[PDB]
From Swiss-Prot, chains A, B, C, D, E, F:
Inducers of expression: By ER stress. Regulated by p53/TP53.
Transmembrane parts of this sequence: 5-25
Quaternary structure and interacting proteins, as annotated: Monomer. Can interact with TRADD and RIPK1. Interacts with HCMV protein UL141; this interaction prevents TNFRSF10B cell surface expression. Two TNFRSF10B monomers interact with a UL141 homodimer. Three TNFRSF10B molecules interact with TNFSF10 homotrimer. In the absence of stimulation, interacts with BIRC2, DDX3X and GSK3B. The interaction with BIRC2 and DDX3X is further enhanced upon receptor stimulation and accompanied by DDX3X and BIRC2 cleavage.
Full-length numbering of the shown residues: 208 to 242 of 440
Location in or out of the cell: Membrane
Protein name: Tumor necrosis factor receptor superfamily member 10B
Function summary: Receptor for the cytotoxic ligand TNFSF10/TRAIL. The adapter molecule FADD recruits caspase-8 to the activated receptor. The resulting death-inducing signaling complex (DISC) performs caspase-8 proteolytic activation which initiates the subsequent cascade of caspases (aspartate-specific cysteine proteases) mediating apoptosis. Promotes the activation of NF-kappa-B. Essential for ER stress-induced apoptosis.
Record PTM: (Microbial infection) Glycosylated on Arg residue by S.typhimurium protein Ssek3.
Disorder: Squamous cell carcinoma of the head and neck: A non-melanoma skin cancer affecting the head and neck. The hallmark of cutaneous SCC is malignant transformation of normal epidermal keratinocytes.
Amino acid sequence: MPGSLSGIIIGVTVAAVVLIVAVFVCKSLLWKKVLP
Amino acid sequence: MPGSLSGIIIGVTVAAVVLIVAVFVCKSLLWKKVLP
Amino acid sequence: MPGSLSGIIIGVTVAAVVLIVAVFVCKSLLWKKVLP
Amino acid sequence: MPGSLSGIIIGVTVAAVVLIVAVFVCKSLLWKKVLP
Amino acid sequence: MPGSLSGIIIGVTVAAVVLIVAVFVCKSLLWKKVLP
Amino acid sequence: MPGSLSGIIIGVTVAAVVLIVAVFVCKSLLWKKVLP
């Protein structure tokens, strides 16, 4: 067990920033609006 | 010599798997009745 | 004894991930608007 | 010369937390009423 | 007792590359670029 | 040069993240549709 515990906690930071991009593109897709 | 540079290799994998899920969500929100 | 700064560094990174799941499950409760 | 590698690693963990708070205040402007 | 349970962590990266070729061959069936 | 088989395995891990972003930017080039 060298110190692999340092490796899992840095991976948690990367998971949060990518999820914010997924909801942002869905709004640009709905920004088309409805033309009556 | 503390730093645990070997730790980064598991972190890069996490960004790839979450991006594939966003493609399935685009199809779920497009599936809603039939357009004649 | 009245705190532990060591516990907090790992604690703040996971908190952001669980916070996104909290608003997402609350949105599922808006489905039940039709009786079988 | 003095480095700054200590600044970016602590910086990414706090950044994700403050970004989610920015979304809730933006909806205060979308608090517009609706007439059926 | 050297085990082999630790082996699964690196195994997750191999799952990402095989999914890219799988969706690409299935997409060609919706656009068969051949004239009769 | 005598072998160094330990060197090739990192190559498959990075291949996944660079390949998915590459096809996504190339799709935006088919957008166009602008009035003078």
